[PDB]
Amino acid sequence: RRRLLPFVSSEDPAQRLKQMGTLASALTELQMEFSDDLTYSSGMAPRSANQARFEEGGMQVLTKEDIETLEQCRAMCKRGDCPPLLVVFDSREGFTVEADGQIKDMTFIAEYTGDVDYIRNREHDDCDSMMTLLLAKDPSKSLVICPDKRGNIARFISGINNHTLDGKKKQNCKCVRYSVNGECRVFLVATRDIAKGERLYYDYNGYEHEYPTQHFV
Amino acid sequence: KAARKSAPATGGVK
């Protein structure tokens, strides 16, 4: 029974302040507001549209044990105990996220946050950071998280190149969708032990193949 | 043309 693990925040308060500063710097660069939750804005999807029972083929449910861990991590972030992560600009990838301390295998990294909208409303959208929330049998019910105006660290995490022979080797975390109180939720979890300085990478095409990755480093 | 990241809804983490 693989249990979700809470992250271990950097012990030095100055290291936590510096980490939080790199995220605030990147958000400011994209003219974004920090948001550690899913937001339901006007002219977009209402909170009522976000029901995991609409997921074609159903959605796995987050256990009480794993919800407790998720609540612990959320409460930790509220008081200033962020996961040990640094947002770093790279000339070949743009903004990237690296571990600024050890992250054990099965450790909760972050929830993918931003504005929830209908997929039907974003067919023409240029946002490079859209993440599937709900895939329904009727496509006009499907939802996407849009961190263009509001979001957190998750929108800055890099993806693997799905076309190269060795590109899968870079993956050290995974994005998963779970039902929490009957709603869809998107989370990032470590898939192996990650060392300080190690850049985070997950598979952007973990279910659909809607993200072009051929040119990825 | 819309690029979208996607994650599975089954199979757990590991």
Ligand SMILES: Nc1ncnc2c1ncn2[C@@H]1O[C@H](CSCC[C@H](N)C(=O)O)[C@@H](O)[C@H]1O
């Ligand atoms: N492995 C990789 N190599 C190159 N670019 C990558 C990459 N993984 C992610 N990216 C870049 O990141 C985008 C996804 S959103 C991730 C945050 C982004 N780099 C930013 O500066 O805000 C992609 O469209 C691509 O431009």
